[PDB]
């Protein structure tokens, strides 16, 4: 099974977790279960407390102006632990009688694990401590709530505009990470206009809300074509564009997947359904002007094993 | 020369001196601490630059305080002449208007940042912040201009007084009204209205959501600002009624020093409620993780 554990300074507390990534199934969320191991005598006149909270970091400066704490909490849970599942019951037998299981549930309408590269974004954090209710007597863990590609392909994207006629339609909606996008553009160019270039770009829209709705216009991949269309001539061509985290570096605020500890993660997956960050992807085609937006969903496929906690090649 | 101009014409006074001394005692250390860290230690951001400029204004204002203390504590016998009263009044007006503008622009920036994030880190640039600071400083400079040109020093029954001298006949009445009304509009009406609208709209937006400490500090700052400048502006406006209509010139003989004391206390406590109270701030004067593994599991 290879359960994952993290200890605390001075060897006082230790928590065992079956997995660190929880999948949202659009109808239920994987329970955050586990077992905490405590020193045999460290709890005299004290009670162990395990807390799971959601942190939405939204700023980092050198001074709070009046009261702005630069960190808002969306969900707070607390467990004391002084029916068991099939995972934590096995941990009790392996550890002994000094282990106390803790059970946590993630309510619906909660943001996924998203991180903004410069760790700003939504993060899930677990604190385990004992007190009669410091960072050297508590266990700090970070977990990710992620969603994968659904089983419904969805309707075929299509969007048309006229001002010159432009038609674009992607083959499908569900695109895997790293999968190139095949888009077909058809133009008529009725009269009295001549397009100098063909521009196809992919931009990432992130819906961040804490007090008001905000939108992001962060292009990911941009493609430029030198083809020119003369009046009363039809032109059909299929372009290939694919988002990738190679030329998008050094772009502050880019939406990325949840980072555990200074790891490398790809672009944030599209959020499918609240206070948090909602990520959406669109494809923009411009003629040089008329603009056509083709929304699409970019999600990971359903895996057969727990994803790694870091990049497989280290250093 | 014998320029004598003789004619025929308290606990409330002592409390003003007490407030002056208390503000002087607390104001200088707090302003110095704010200057030292924001100017040199902390990183140079828009908020840091704005607070540094506000602290500079407050420091100069409290450094020219003791001249006013000597002026007020001896029944108005200003022993400095004509080349110092005008400069002191001009610098005090400059500092107070700069401080008011800095607080109102801080409120504007807070409202913009917490309500309109779509355009919050696009126009907010250190160069733009410097332009705004320069504009504020030159506005406060060429808004207290008549205070350096109108004041004159005369005799008041064996007491030398430097006063605005709003008589440089027909122009005497209009000039007195215009300056006081302009000061009221630009120092008490527009900034207070901006602070009220910006803060209340922030509260309404936050109320339609799910920090408690954020509201309390805003309310405390608002009430502290309101209760101090209000007596000063009301008494300044009341001066017009003396020349316009009949008056007794009795209530204004002692209310003005108390209003000035309240204003100075507000200036002293602005660092207290803005910089000198945040939780993160106190941490560094006190000064001045494990690795994730894995284990087995029986089947």
């Amino acid at each position: 099974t290879r359960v994952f554990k993290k200890s605390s300074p001075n060897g006082k507390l230790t928590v065992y977790l079956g997995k660190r990534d929880f999948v949202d199934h659009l109808d239920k969320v994987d329970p955050v279960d586990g077992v905490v191991l405590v020193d045999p005598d460290y709890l005299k006149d004290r009670k162990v407390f395990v807390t799971l909270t959601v942190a939405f970091r939204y700023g980092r400066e050198d001074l709070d102006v009046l009261g702005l704490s630069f960190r808002k909490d969306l969900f707070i849970a607390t467990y004391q632990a002084f029916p068991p599942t099939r995972l934590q019951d096995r941990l009790l037998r392996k550890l002994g009688q000094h282990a106390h299981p803790f059970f946590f549930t993630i309510p619906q309408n909660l943001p996924s694990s998203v991180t903004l590269q410069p760790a700003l974004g939504v993060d899930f954090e677990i604190r385990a401590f004992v007190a009669k209710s410091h960072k050297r007597n508590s266990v700090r863990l970070v977990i990710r709530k992620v969603q994968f590609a659904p089983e419904k392909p969805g309707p075929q994207p299509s969007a048309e505009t006229t001002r010159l006629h432009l038609e674009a339609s992607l083959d499908k909606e569900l695109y895997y990470h790293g999968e190139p996008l095949n888009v077909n553009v058809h133009v008529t160019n009725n009269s009295t206009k001549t397009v100098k270039k063909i521009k196809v770009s992919v931009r990432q829209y992130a819906d961040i809300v804490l007090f008001s709705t905000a939108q992001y216009k962060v292009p990911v991949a941009q493609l430029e074509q030198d083809d020119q269309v003369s009046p009363s001539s039809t032109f059909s061509k299929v372009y290939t564009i694919t988002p990738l985290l190679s030329d998008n570096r050094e772009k502050r605020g880019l939406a990325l997947d949840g980072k555990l500890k200074h790891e490398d993660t790809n672009l944030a997956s599209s959020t499918i359904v609240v206070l948090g960050i909602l990520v959406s992807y669109r494809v923009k085609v411009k003629l040089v002007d008329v603009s056509v937006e083709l929304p699409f969903v970019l999600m990971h496929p359903k895996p057969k094993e727990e994803p790694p906690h870091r990049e497989v090649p280290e250093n | 020369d014998y320029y004598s101009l003789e004619s025929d014409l308290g606990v409330v006074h002592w409390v003003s001196l007490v407030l002056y001394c208390l503000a002087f005692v607390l104001g200088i250390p707090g302003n110095a601490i704010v200057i030292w860290f924001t100017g040199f230690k902390w990183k140079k951001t828009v908020t840091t630059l704005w607070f540094l400029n506000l602290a500079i204004a407050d420091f100069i204002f409290l450094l020219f305080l003791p001249l006013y203390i000597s002026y007020v504590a001896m029944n108005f016998h200003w022993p400095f002449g004509i080349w110092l009263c005008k400069a002191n009044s001009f610098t005090a007006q400059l500092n107070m208007f700069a401080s008011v503008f800095f607080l109102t622009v801080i409120s504007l920036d807070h409202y913009i940042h917490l309500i309109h994030p779509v355009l919050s880190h696009r126009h907010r640039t250190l160069k733009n912040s410097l332009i705004v600071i320069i504009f504020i400083w030159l506005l406060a400079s060429l808004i207290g201009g008549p205070a350096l040109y109108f004041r004159d020093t005369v005799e008041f029954n064996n007491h030398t007084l430097c006063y605005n001298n709003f008589q440089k006949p027909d122009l005497t009445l209009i000039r007195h009204h215009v300056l006081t009304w302009v000061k009221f509009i630009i120092g008490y009406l527009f900034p207070l209205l901006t602070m009220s609208i910006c803060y209340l709209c922030l509260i309404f937006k936050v109320k339609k959501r799910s920090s408690s400490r954020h509201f309390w500090t805003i309310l405390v700052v608002v009430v502290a600002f309101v209760v101090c400048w209000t007596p000063y502006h009301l008494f300044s406006i009341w001066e017009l009624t003396i020349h316009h209509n009949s008056y007794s010139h009795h209530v204004m003989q002692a209310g003005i020093p108390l209003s000035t004391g309240l204003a100075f206390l507000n200036s002293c406590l602005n660092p207290i409620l803005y910089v000198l109270i945040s939780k993160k701030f106190q941490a560094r004067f006190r000064s001045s993780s494990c690795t994730t593994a894995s284990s087995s599991l029986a089947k």
Partner: nanobody, 98 residues
Framework: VQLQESGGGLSCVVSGFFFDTVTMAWYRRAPGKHRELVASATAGGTTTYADSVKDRFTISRDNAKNTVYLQMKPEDTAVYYC????????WGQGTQVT
């Protein structure tokens, strides 16, 4: 870190952490299976041994010698390990025992 187990053919010496107000335990895995617990030792007063090794196995610790001596029919042939009761330190290696 630097978990250097000695004895056999039993003492463990740690470098990073300290034995101050912590409980240290010895783990014997199995002849051919996963890990198991043998005995523990708190700061002093409650030794709390196990049942199978009881009478047959003892334990001791010195807060100044920076070492833990475990003192010890044919089923005790495995690889012994010394670690914190909460299993905080990285798992080391034991030479042998028979």
């Amino acid at each position: 870190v630097q978990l250097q187990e000695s004895g056999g053919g039993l003492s463990c010496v740690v470098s990073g952490f300290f034995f101050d107000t912590v409980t240290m335990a010895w783990y014997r895995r199995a002849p051919g299976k996963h890990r198991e617990l043998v005995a523990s030792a708190t700061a002093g007063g409650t030794t709390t041994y196990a049942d199978s090794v009881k009478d047959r196995f003892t334990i001791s610790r010195d807060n100044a010698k920076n070492t833990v001596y475990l003192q010890m029919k044919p089923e005790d042939t495995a690889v012994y390990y010394c670690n914190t009761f909460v299993r905080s330190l990285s798992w080391g290696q034991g030479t042998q025992v028979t």
